[PDB]
Structure formats: structure tokens, C-alpha cells
Design a protein around this ligand. Structure first.
Ligand SMILES: *[C@@H]1O[C@H](CO)[C@@H](O[C@@H]2O[C@H](CO)[C@@H](O[C@@H]3O[C@H](CO)[C@@H](O)[C@H](O)[C@@H]3O)[C@H](O)[C@H]2NC(C)=O)[C@H](O)[C@H]1NC(C)=O
Ligand SMILES: *[C@@H]1O[C@H](CO)[C@@H](O[C@@H]2O[C@H](CO)[C@@H](O)[C@H](O)[C@H]2NC(C)=O)[C@H](O)[C@H]1NC(C)=O
Ligand SMILES: OC[C@H]1O[C@@](CO)(O[C@H]2O[C@H](CO)[C@@H](O)[C@H](O)[C@H]2O)[C@@H](O)[C@@H]1O
Ligand SMILES: OC[C@H]1O[C@@](CO)(O[C@H]2O[C@H](CO)[C@@H](O)[C@H](O)[C@H]2O)[C@@H](O)[C@@H]1O
Ligand SMILES: *[C@@H]1O[C@H](CO)[C@@H](O)[C@H](O)[C@H]1NC(C)=O
Ligand SMILES: *[C@@H]1O[C@H](CO)[C@@H](O)[C@H](O)[C@H]1NC(C)=O
Ligand SMILES: *[C@@H]1O[C@H](CO)[C@@H](O)[C@H](O)[C@H]1NC(C)=O
Ligand SMILES: *[C@@H]1O[C@H](CO)[C@@H](O)[C@H](O)[C@H]1NC(C)=O
Ligand SMILES: *[C@@H]1O[C@H](CO)[C@@H](O)[C@H](O)[C@H]1NC(C)=O
Ligand SMILES: *[C@@H]1O[C@H](CO)[C@@H](O)[C@H](O)[C@H]1NC(C)=O
Ligand SMILES: *[C@@H]1O[C@H](CO)[C@@H](O)[C@H](O)[C@H]1NC(C)=O
Ligand SMILES: *[C@@H]1O[C@H](CO)[C@@H](O)[C@H](O)[C@H]1NC(C)=O
Ligand SMILES: *[C@@H]1O[C@H](CO)[C@@H](O)[C@H](O)[C@H]1NC(C)=O
Ligand SMILES: *[C@@H]1O[C@H](CO)[C@@H](O)[C@H](O)[C@H]1NC(C)=O
Ligand SMILES: *[C@@H]1O[C@H](CO)[C@@H](O)[C@H](O)[C@H]1NC(C)=O
Ligand SMILES: *[C@@H]1O[C@H](CO)[C@@H](O)[C@H](O)[C@H]1NC(C)=O
Ligand SMILES: *[C@@H]1O[C@H](CO)[C@@H](O)[C@H](O)[C@H]1NC(C)=O
Ligand SMILES: *[C@@H]1O[C@H](CO)[C@@H](O)[C@H](O)[C@H]1NC(C)=O
Ligand SMILES: *[C@H]1O[C@H](CO)[C@@H](O)[C@H](O)[C@@H]1O
Ligand SMILES: *[C@H]1O[C@H](CO)[C@@H](O)[C@H](O)[C@@H]1O
Ligand SMILES: *[C@H]1O[C@H](CO)[C@@H](O)[C@H](O)[C@@H]1O
Ligand SMILES: *[C@H]1O[C@H](CO)[C@@H](O)[C@H](O)[C@@H]1O
Ligand SMILES: *[C@H]1O[C@H](CO)[C@@H](O)[C@H](O)[C@@H]1O
Ligand SMILES: *[C@H]1O[C@H](CO)[C@@H](O)[C@H](O)[C@@H]1O
Ligand SMILES: *[C@H]1O[C@H](CO)[C@@H](O)[C@H](O)[C@@H]1O
Lengths: 525, 526
């Protein structure tokens, strides 16, 4: 009737040896366990890896996995599959280290249907994984191949395929460019993305360096060089270098940044010298794009945590640490003044959208929506606000009190009065365009005490807020502003589960059209 | 026995007309009123302006001033003087708008001892102010001059001296380079610093653009192009472009950033394409460097607030909104891995350092220091930690518990609840190795808890272990300087109850670690 806050020992106890060829069973009933986001059956998960779609339309998600602990270490490649990026099936571990003093760090996977690698004489469904093997003294790039659709991998006989004699050289992202393979890889502590080329994925030639761009933090990680279509014109696209930095992000710990530019097969040249942060909150890192997608779709998934507190979050009693972000559709757009912007929207949520909890058209009202009866404890909401053309042509017409206040309130059934999360936007006044996203300290004993668990985040719009999409999923809130122009991923660990949300609008100009839609989400587990 | 939390109406009531040629009297006794930082006698202050040292060694501080309200507006240039940058004397308003429909926005001031301007036929102590005049439709650059040492200014007869037909064109920073005047000015909403040259400060010629560098935010503001000496070698220096952005900073609202590079009199070229943030907290903005300083001293001062909550902070009942940061000595250094770093240390604090409250050498101890008895409610603290060479060579020898925890605790003698007002946590190792957390707990401040932009927690991660930590607490402000000012944070605190105590705990340190803690009370400058 209420989601368990602690699980039986059977569900939380980790084995002393790594299971091979068997699906690790998971209890997904925890009060903090997300129901539409991916999380491992048990153990510790970090970066997504080897993300690709096979020819039959199955999306493969691999991930950094510690099967033995609820902290980072003993890295293997976990594996889950999905047709829709929401209904996940857990698979046996896909890539193992050679021994117990080695770890399988991040990497990518590609289809090799034309058998450029020479691994696939009798199949057009060959998968090649390119990943970092970590040793006490070295980080080297290794190749493994799968003839069975990416469930079981055989190491390349002549591994490693690439080394620079460094233990700060990792996160290979490989893709096809016209007539050759490209590898983007991080010389992490030199703030350099090295680009290599190959005809066969085993012989790598240095092409170019991308160094000392944007925020340095303490390290470049998980580079992604991808072609992203324009939001308003699918026929147009630009190249984007996405770099994860950890530690040393402005909000502390880990953050993603991106650089729009040109790629010609050997060199990436940023259009300008500007730094652009992907997410205005703290809990979005190591975004990886899916290889071999259909229809020029840019599909990404990120790790929904921060390295400053990911190994301390209070979910280990619920048999997991860390979830992935919602899968994302990516576009590029120009926003007023700022220009280049990476758009992020949730990938088609239709497969998980349950019955409507509220549809409202009232301006200057408070909508109270109870979802104690939604067993997932997960809701989607959409708020459209269309100001009259008068208020767009003369912003001085907008009242200083013109505001949107969204609050997520604790459950009356399943447990002090503090909201678990707040969203505040002002159209005008002294903080015009300021959007505040908060996880109040007062709502979480754990969050209050953790010295890196920041309570408050903000983004300032130039254009008025016209659209707001949100997904709440037990311990996670994702917000998308003005068709994904601005995006924030925020973990919440309230003492009491959320059971309710209030949506207040106030001081809106005469003739403002407000449309509020709220739907419960169906659990994927 | 306790600092007033509200003041008499005579002290808070603002006049309806701006006072001319008269010093505005101020009550500096408020529980939130800093005692070693500058704040205006009453009204609302933002960016520092016209910062310069006259030839007799008097530092002139001008500032964006609303004399009529406790919010932004009706901008004039306020004026305060000091020989040591701590003992401030309030002066009459220095620069007035021509009209009630005009505002004096930010700008700089230079000595013109060789009379290049032609304003100073009979003095070598001439001061020229170059500032933005704001009108409803235009932002233009104007000149005013002072023959009396920068107390009274006459507008240039043929103002404005620079206009581009824009209302997003402001914050002129002017300096002498070899044989000509340089102006750095912000084309704010185009994310461009325009550089102009002049022989006489009245005729300006376009030289170069510096565009789309580092974080854009929503606007480039308060550019500073300055020569900053190397920390470890005073004979070496590099040029630095300092740009303030507001809104749209990562932490929200306002932040400073800098670009080391080369300047050749017309063009600034950054050494790389990297973005570098000056302060790891939220309350440091619109840093301006002092013109005409002695030696090779890089001296800066910032506005110690954030535009997201500066007009809502609960200090108006104490007859002021906004203080300046501590004055800062600036250097450039290379830090491990990251490379280029703007060093910030407090300018000579000696003139305000009172009697010692504690000197300790104990490692693995909690030192409790009460300052209920220091009337300023202002303390300076230094913590030096020297790890053994073994731990410097093999960091695996450092325990996961190796930590430094400093807490500023509420007064029991002056109640308005047991929550610290400010915390500092550093880990040498463990899962967050090198992580320094600076916090202002929500639970300690009803106002801070409720304000949706008043962020509780800030962090910076070191590569090198923490070897030095300097801090100044001043009633409503904490400034920390890490590893000889390599890393720096300014943080406002508005606790319900004033701070009366600080705990300094060290724990899990390797065998033979040397710890030296010095804590001194500060003497009020008012
Ligand atoms: C140096 O930088 C300044 C500021 O970036 C440049 O002036 C500016 O030029 C840009 C681009 O031409 C102007 O932007 C455009 O304005 C028009 C007019 O409304 C608009 O229709 C366009 O869509 C675009 O936004 C901008 O107005 C202007 N900024 C000012 C005057 O402050 C200047 O041209 C640069 N000089 C050189 C030699 O690069
Ligand atoms: C491409 O970048 C790499 C990584 O920065 C360069 O290799 C390094 O070179 C620096 C000096 O420039 C050394 O101190 C580092 O130890 C090296 N790091 C690694 C990971 O090798 C490399 O030289 C660059 N190549 C070119 C063509 O410029
Ligand atoms: O699991 C290793 C994998 O994670 C990344 C970031 O996704 O690096 C993280 O883990 C590393 C190994 O402990 C740390 O050095 C690094 O600081 C942390 O970000 C990838 O770079 C790596 O492939
Ligand atoms: O007092 C104006 C002065 O302040 C700065 C930044 O310190 O700009 C601030 O005030 C402007 C006009 O009031 C705002 O447009 C801006 O957002 C705010 O940062 C300087 O640019 C200006 O000279
Ligand atoms: C484990 O394998 C890695 C690479 O395969 C190698 O560097 C390491 O020395 C091996 N360890 C042992 C102890 O065999
Ligand atoms: C990959 O191709 C390169 C050049 O064609 C060659 O040097 C190398 O031997 C090839 N490797 C394999 C295993 O085919
Ligand atoms: C790609 O562009 C770079 C410079 O941007 C140039 O040096 C290189 O030769 C180009 N390569 C190709 C494949 O055109
Ligand atoms: C943004 O504007 C620039 C300059 O006009 C243009 O080069 C680019 O194609 C635009 N990007 C998008 C996504 O429209
Ligand atoms: C809100 O507007 C968006 C376009 O931004 C549109 O996709 C959606 O249909 C609207 N939502 C509702 C439920 O009206
Ligand atoms: C906006 O309306 C005000 C009165 O509300 C008017 O004085 C001003 O000129 C208008 N501005 C524009 C953009 O027309
Ligand atoms: C909302 O309130 C504002 C000011 O309070 C008023 O001008 C406007 O008519 C109201 N809108 C509606 C839909 O009631
Ligand atoms: C003072 O008011 C006049 C009237 O429009 C305006 O033109 C001028 O720009 C204002 N301030 C000054 C003298 O620039
Ligand atoms: C400077 O002194 C002269 C006489 O030496 C006096 O006439 C004048 O008013 C002063 N300033 C100038 C030259 O206007
Ligand atoms: C300032 O020098 C300029 C040359 O750029 C000239 O146009 C102007 O006449 C001069 N003004 C003076 C000397 O007052
Ligand atoms: C300054 O450097 C710029 C950019 O390198 C160059 O265009 C200009 O000629 C230089 N000016 C001088 C005075 O050397
Ligand atoms: C930092 O390193 C660079 C490259 O070695 C050097 O040129 C520069 O002068 C150094 N800067 C300082 C402040 O030491
Ligand atoms: C810390 O070290 C510096 C330089 O070594 C020294 O001047 C200062 O007095 C020291 N402070 C303490 C508390 O030891
Ligand atoms: C501090 O305590 C630890 C145990 O936590 C001990 O091993 C270490 O030697 C102590 N350090 C000093 C310098 O006394
Ligand atoms: C999880 O927490 C709940 C209360 O929040 C307990 O009822 C349960 O036993 C477990 O400790
Ligand atoms: C929640 O309750 C379980 C029993 O199901 C305990 O094992 C656990 O320690 C927690 O209190
Ligand atoms: C498995 O792990 C959890 C905590 O991670 C415990 O709550 C449980 O008792 C079991 O040991
Ligand atoms: C299944 O096989 C793998 C291969 O290394 C082991 O890691 C695991 O413990 C089990 O033997
Ligand atoms: C300032 O606040 C204090 C308590 O915090 C009171 O003593 C005083 O009356 C004023 O409200
Ligand atoms: C300071 O001023 C406040 C006004 O809010 C008074 O209540 C208090 O008594 C003191 O005079
Ligand atoms: C300062 O506060 C006093 C109340 O003590 C007012 O009378 C005055 O106008 C100003 O607001």
C-alpha cells in the first residue's frame, strides 16, 4: 500500500563473485526507485556505454557497473535492452575485465554491417565495442566484438589497439564518417579530446587535438562528437562536441558542456570560443548518444547523479545506487540573444503515459493534483502559457507579480510540511525571467546534512516562459523549458514520499491562455 | 550588550531629493552591518566605479548609488576615501545625472598628470572620470574632470564622447598604454568587449572586438583589461581580461570570469579558448581594479552580492543594502593540472587586526573560539596544514577521514536555531578527495530558506592538498582564501541569531602532520 523504504536482505545483499551468463534479479519497489528511468537490478551504476540501436529496432544500453558494491569500482559493462527506451529488460553482464586488478571503463559500440573489422565474415549484424581498460598504471583502448547481437563479446586477439603511455586516456566514442571510422577520446587531465581515424576499428592514426575549450574543471571525460539536427528544420544540422567535466564543475563535481561547430572527418572547429552548459542543475553527467538510430534522430541518455554525493545517496537500502536520465531527443536551435542552444526533450513518453489526473484552462488559479492513487508515484505534467501579443510587444504591461509556482508536497497516506521540490518563474519584476528550481533542505534530513547536496538552482530566460514539461519519478525531477531549450535534472530524497503537486499562476495579463495537463505514468517494472 | 537588529527611523528614512555637496550621515551599528568592509551610509549600492589612488596615497572608491531607495535606480556616483582600503571616510556624491530622466552608470577614473585632456592647464593632480550615462533610449560614454582631487566633477562641454546608437553599451574602463589611452567597454547583449583608443580621452577611435569568449550569461558587463604580476616572480606579468556576466551565471545571476592573454595597445588575444570563474560562491561581482597604484600592486574590489537577491536582502531596516568585498591583492599563478589561475588575497589586513583569540598547534583537535566578546563581531583566521612528505608522495597513506571542519555557531547571549550560520568542510582523501564545501545552512536563516535564489552550498575541488586557509567573518559576510589565494569565495550570511563562536576541527590527519591555527578579532573601522 506504501512503497517499502527498506527491502529484505535477499534483495540488497550483493554476491562476493560476479555472476556470468545470468540476469541479476532486482527488487524495483523501493520508495526512491524510479519507475520510468533505468536503474540496475542491484549494485552501483555510473556512465552509460555502447548505446546503439540494432537493425530489428532494439536499443542496447550498456553502463558502468559495480556488481560487488554500492560504490564505484570493479567496473564491468552492465546491459539492458528496450524497443521504446522506457520498458527495459535486464541482460547478463556484457563485458568483463580480464582479471580482478583491471576494470572495463567507458566506451561506445557500433554496428559493422559491411565487415570493415574482418570479425563478421558470415553476419551483417556484427557489433564492435571500443572501450578503455583501466590497469593500475595505464588506460588503453581495447576492441571486443559480438556475433549474437551485443549480448556476449569476444576480446580482439591483438588488444590493446591504442595507448599513449598514460593512465589519463579514456572514453572512446567511435562513429562512421563517409569512408572511415573516427574515435573521439579524452586525454582527461590535459583537457584535450584526441581524434583518431581507422579503416577497420583496430588500426588507429592520430588526426587532430581539441584542447583547452570551455570550462576545464579537473578533467575532460566521455567526449561525444555528433551531428544534431535543427529543431525548426530537420534537413539542416551542425556537429556538436559534448564534453563531460569532473570534478570542478561550477555547481561542484560533474557537469556536461557542448561546442557547436564543423567536423570534416579529421578536425573539429568550434564556431566561437564560448562555453555552454547543457543542464542548469547538478544531476546530469556523461551523456552518450545512441549509434545507428533511424530518421536522423539525435537520441541521448545521461547518468542522473553528481560525483560529489552519488556514493552517499540513501538508496542502497533499496538495492541500487544511480539511475539514468530520461532518454532525450536532441536538436540545435538559436534562442534570443544567447544564440546556439542544445535542445533536450524526453524521447516519446507515450508508452508510459497513463490516465489523465487533471486538464485545466484557468489562469490566475492554483490547481491541486493528488497522485497518492498512482502506484508508480510518477507523473508527467505540461504547462503552456500563451501571453497576448500585446504583452510580447510591450513587456512593461506585465505585472511584477506575474509568476508560475509549482510545488511537490509530501504524501498524507505514506508518512515535515516542506515541499520536496519547487519551481518558481517570474515574467517581470526585479528578477524578470528568473526560473528557480529547489529541493528544500527542510524536506530531507540526508540532503540537509550532505555538504555538496545543493538546495537551489536557477536559469534566466530572455523570452517569456511559454511551455514547461516535467517528469517526477519518486526520487528524480526533470524539467524542460520552452520546447527543451533549457533543461534540469534534479535528484530529491524527501523523508516522506511526494503524493501531491500544486500549480499556481498569478498576475498574468488579460487574455493570457493557460493549459495544464497532468498524467500519471505506468511503472515499466 | 547586543547589536541592534533594527534602527531608529532617522537612520533608515531616505530623503526625497538627492543631497548635494554634503556627506550623508550613516548608522553603522546594525547586526548585519560589516565593520571592516565598505557599505554606504544609507541607500542601495552596487558596482564599484572610478577606483584610483591619488599621488598622496589616498584611495578613492566611487560606487553605483541610489540615494533615494533601498533598490537599484536613480544611479549616482557615491564616493568614499581611505589610505589603507579599510578605514573609509564617506564623501559627498561625486557625479550627478544631468536630469531626473538620466542615470550615471558604471565607469573608471584616471590621473591625467601630463594634461593630455587639456582640462588641467594649472594642475598635475587632474582626475578624469569616463562613465556611461543611461537614458531611456541610449547608453553613451561621457567625460567629467576634477581639479580638486576627485571630490567635485565638471562635465566635459562636448559630451557625449562615444555613442554607437545603442542602449546596451556601457562600463568604460580606461587606462594609459605607452603613448595612448585605451577604453574597454561592453557591447553588453552582443557578448563583445569593444576596445577604443584616444590621445586626449575625448576623441575615441575603434581598435578591436573581443567577442563570444567563456560563459556568455545574458550580458557582458564591467570589463577590466589589467596587467597582473606572477605570484612567485614580481618581475613577470600577463594581461588579463576580466568580464562580469549577469544574469545567466552557472550558480544563477551574476559572476566574474577572466581570460589571461596578451594586449599590444589595440587587441587582446586570450592564450587559449578556456572559461575561468574567479570566485566559487555567488556573492562576488563587478570587480574593478584601482588605477594609478604604486609598485606593481594589482588591487581590486568587488560588489559582495548577487543580482538575484541583492534588492531583497534583510538589511534595509539597518539603513543599507550591499557591501564591497575585502580589497584584494591580485597575482597570476600556475596551479597543478588546471594551469592559469587568478590569485586573490585580502589587501594588508594589519590596520584592522586586533588582539589574538587563539594560537593552537594541535592536530586531531577541535578548537572552540568564542568572540561574543569582540564588539566588531568580525574575526580573521589562518589555518596552515603541512602534511608529511610520505603523504605528499603517497596520497594512499592519507586516511579517508582526513578532514578539516570549520563551523560558525550562533550566539547564546543574543538570541532572536542551533544550526551553524556557515560551515567549511574539506576532505584530503576518501570518495570526495580534494572537495571543499562552503555552506550557509537554510535552517539558520528564515529569510535565506524562503528566498528561492539564496543557494545554501558551494564547493571547489583542489588537486593539491589544502596547505593554507585564510578567512574573514564580518557579521553578514564570510570570505575564504585557499592555498595562498589560489581559490577564493565570498558568501553573504543572514542568520536569525548573530554568530558568537567558531569551531575548527581537524581529524584523521597522517602521523607528523603540522597544524597551526591563528584567530584574531578585527577592530571596527566605523
Ligand atoms: C564590434 O562589436 C560590435 C558589437 O558586437 C559590433 O556592432 C554590432 O554589430 C552587430 C552585427 O552587425 C549588430 O547586430 C545586429 O544588429 C542589427 C540592427 O538591429 C540586427 O538587425 C541584427 O539582427 C544584429 O542583431 C549590433 O547592433 C552592433 N552592436 C552595437 C552597435 O553595440 C561591431 O560591428 C563590431 N565591429 C567589428 C569591426 O567587428
Ligand atoms: C595532442 O594532445 C596530447 C594530450 O595533450 C598531447 O600529448 C601530451 O603532450 C603534453 C605536452 O604537449 C605532455 O606533457 C603530455 O604528457 C602528453 N599527454 C598525453 C596524453 O600524451 C599531444 O602531444 C598532442 N599532439 C599534438 C600533435 O599536438
Ligand atoms: O567508471 C569509470 C568511467 O567514469 C568516468 C566518468 O563517467 O570517470 C569517473 O570515474 C573515474 C574512475 O574512477 C574517475 O577518474 C573520474 O574522476 C570519474 O569522473 C569516465 O571517465 C570513466 O570511463
Ligand atoms: O548600476 C548600473 C551598472 O550595473 C551593472 C552591473 O553592475 O548593470 C546592472 O544594472 C543594469 C541596469 O540597471 C542591468 O541592466 C544589469 O542587468 C545589471 O547587471 C553595470 O552594467 C551598470 O553600469
Ligand atoms: C590484468 O590484466 C591487465 C590487462 O589485461 C594487466 O595490465 C594486469 O597486469 C593483469 N593483472 C594481473 C595481476 O594479471
Ligand atoms: C587495418 O588496416 C590497416 C591499413 O589498411 C592495416 O595496417 C591493418 O593490418 C589492418 N588490420 C586488420 C586486422 O585487418
Ligand atoms: C579539415 O580541416 C582542417 C582545418 O580545420 C584541415 O587542416 C584538414 O586538412 C581538413 N581535413 C580534411 C579531411 O579536409
Ligand atoms: C543560428 O544563427 C547562426 C547565425 O545566423 C547560423 O549560422 C546558424 O545556422 C543558426 N543555428 C540554428 C540552429 O538556426
Ligand atoms: C503545449 O504546447 C506544445 C508546443 O510547445 C504542444 O506540443 C502541446 O500540444 C501543448 N500541450 C497541451 C496539452 O496543450
Ligand atoms: C509600453 O507601454 C508604456 C505604458 O504602459 C508606454 O509608455 C511605452 O511607450 C510602451 N512601450 C512600447 C514598447 O511601446
Ligand atoms: C489575472 O490577474 C491580473 C492581475 O491580478 C489581471 O489583470 C488579469 O485579468 C487576471 N487574469 C485572469 C484570467 O483573471
Ligand atoms: C536630459 O533630457 C533630455 C530631453 O529629452 C535628453 O535629450 C537628454 O539626453 C537627457 N540627459 C542628457 C542631457 O543627456
Ligand atoms: C590657469 O591659470 C591662468 C593664469 O595663470 C588662469 O587665467 C586660468 O583661468 C587657469 N585655467 C585656465 C588656463 O583656464
Ligand atoms: C583629440 O585628438 C583627436 C585625434 O583622434 C582630435 O580629433 C581632437 O581634435 C582632439 N581633441 C582635443 C585635442 O581637444
Ligand atoms: C596587435 O595584435 C593584433 C592581433 O594580433 C594585430 O592585428 C595588430 O597589428 C597588433 N597591433 C600592434 C600595435 O602591434
Ligand atoms: C604558466 O605556464 C605557462 C606555460 O608553461 C607559462 O608560459 C606561463 O608564464 C605560466 N604562468 C605563470 C603565472 O606562471
Ligand atoms: C601560514 O604560512 C604563512 C607562510 O608560510 C605564514 O606567513 C603565516 O603566518 C602562517 N600562518 C599560520 C597560522 O601559521
Ligand atoms: C589522527 O588520528 C588518526 C586516527 O584517526 C591517527 O592514525 C593519526 O596518527 C592522527 N594524526 C595525528 C597527526 O596525530
Ligand atoms: C524505511 O523508513 C520507513 C520510515 O520512513 C520505515 O518505516 C521502514 O522500516 C524503513 O526504516
Ligand atoms: C528496513 O527493514 C528491514 C527488514 O525488512 C531491515 O533489514 C532494514 O535494516 C531496514 O530497517
Ligand atoms: C542489504 O543492504 C542494505 C543496505 O545497503 C541493508 O539495509 C540490508 O540489511 C542488507 O544488508
Ligand atoms: C563468470 O565468468 C566471469 C569471467 O571473468 C567471472 O568474472 C565471474 O566471476 C564468473 O566466473
Ligand atoms: C530586530 O530583530 C530582533 C530579533 O531578531 C529584535 O530584538 C528587534 O525587535 C528587531 O525586530
Ligand atoms: C528598530 O526599528 C523597528 C521598526 O521595524 C522597531 O520595531 C524596533 O523597535 C527598533 O526601533
Ligand atoms: C527605515 O525604517 C523606518 C522604520 O523604523 C521607516 O520609518 C523609514 O521610512 C525607513 O523605511
Amino acid at each position: 500500500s506504501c512503497a517499502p523504504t527498506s527491502l529484505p536482505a535477499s534483495a540488497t545483499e550483493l554476491p562476493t563473485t560476479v555472476p556470468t551468463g545470468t540476469v541479476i534479479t532486482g527488487d524495483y519497489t523501493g520508495s526512491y526507485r524510479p519507475q520510468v528511468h533505468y536503474s540496475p537490478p542491484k549494485g552501483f551504476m555510473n556512465a552509460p556505454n555502447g548505446c546503439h540501436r540494432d537493425r530489428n529496432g532494439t536499443y542496447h544500453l550498456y553502463y558502468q557497473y559495480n556488481p560487488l558494491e554500492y560504490v564505484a569500482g570493479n567496473q564491468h559493462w552492465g546491459h539492458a535492452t528496450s524497443d521504446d527506451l522506457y520498458h527495459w529488460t535486464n541482460q547478463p553482464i556484457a563485458i568483463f575485465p580480464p582479471n580482478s586488478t583491471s576494470q572495463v571503463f567507458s566506451g561506445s559500440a557500433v554496428l559493422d554491417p559491411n565487415n570493415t573489422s574482418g570479425f563478421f565474415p558470415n553476419t551483417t549484424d556484427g557489433v564492435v565495442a571500443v572501450y578503455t581498460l583501466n590497469t593500475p598504471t595505464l588506460q588503453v583502448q581495447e576492441v571486443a566484438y559480438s556475433t549474437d547481437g551485443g549480448y556476449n563479446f569476444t576480446p580482439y586477439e591483438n588488444n590493446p589497439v591504442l595507448s599513449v603511455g598514460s593512465n589519463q586516456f579514456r572514453d572512446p566514442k567511435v562513429f562512421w564518417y563517409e569512408d572511415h571510422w573516427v574515435m573521439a577520446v579524452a586525454a582527461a587531465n590535459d583537457f584535450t579530446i584526441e581524434i583518431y581515424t581507422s579503416p577497420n576499428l583496430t588500426s588507429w592514426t592520430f588526426a587532430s587535438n581539441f584542447t583547452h575549450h570551455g570550462l576545464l574543471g579537473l578533467a575532460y571525460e566521455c567526449p561525444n562528437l555528433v551531428q544534431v539536427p535543427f529543431q525548426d528544420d530537420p534537413s539542416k544540422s551542425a556537429w556538436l562536441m559534448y564534453i563531460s567535466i569532473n570534478p570542478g564543475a561550477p555547481l561542484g563535481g560533474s557537469v556536461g558542456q557542448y561546442f557547436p561547430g564543423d567536423f570534416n572527418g579529421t578536425h573539429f572547429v568550434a564556431y566561437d570560443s564560448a562555453a555552454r552548459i547543457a543542464d542548469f542543475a547538478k544531476d546530469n553527467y556523461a551523456s552518450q548518444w545512441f549509434a545507428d538510430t533511424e530518421n536522423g534522430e539525435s537520441i541521448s541518455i545521461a547518468w542522473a547523479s553528481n560525483w560529489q554525493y552519488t556514493q552517499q545517496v540513501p538508496t542502497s537500502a533499496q538495492a541500487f545506487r544511480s539511475a539514468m536520465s530520461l532518454p532525450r531527443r536532441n536538436y540545435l536551435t538559436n534562442i534570443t540573444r544567447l544564440g546556439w542552444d542544445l535542445v533536450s526533450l524526453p524521447y516519446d513518453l507515450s508508452p508510459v503515459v497513463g490516465p489523465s489526473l487533471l486538464s485545466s484552462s484557468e489562469a490566475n488559479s492554483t490547481a491541486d493534483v493528488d497522485f497518492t492513487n498512482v502506484t508508480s508515484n510518477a507523473v508527467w505534467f505540461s504547462l503552456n502559457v500563451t501571453l497576448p501579443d500585446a504583452a510580447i510587444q510591450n513587456a512593461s504591461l506585465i505585472s511584477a507579480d506575474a509568476s508560475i509556482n509549482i510545488t511537490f508536497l509530501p504524501s498524507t497516506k505514506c508518512s515535515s510540511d516542506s515541499p520536496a521540490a519547487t519551481l518558481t518563474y517570474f515574467y517581470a519584476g526585479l528578477t524578470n525571467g528568473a526560473l528557480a528550481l529547489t529541493r528544500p533542505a527542510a524536506s530531507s534530513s540526508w540532503g540537509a546534512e550532505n555538504p555538496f547536496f545543493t538546495d537551489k538552482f536557477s536559469y534566466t530566460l530572455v523570452d517569456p516562459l511559454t511551455s514547461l514539461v516535467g517528469v517526477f519519478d519518486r526520487s528524480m525531477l526533470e524539467v524542460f523549458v520552452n520546447e527543451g531549450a533549457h533543461s534540469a535534472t534534479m535528484l530529491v530524497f524527501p523523508d516522506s514520499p511526494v503524493g501531491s503537486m500544486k500549480v499556481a499562476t498569478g498576475g498574468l495579463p488579460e487574455g493570457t491562455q493557460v493549459n495544464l495537463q497532468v498524467n500519471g505514468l505506468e511503472s515499466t517494472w
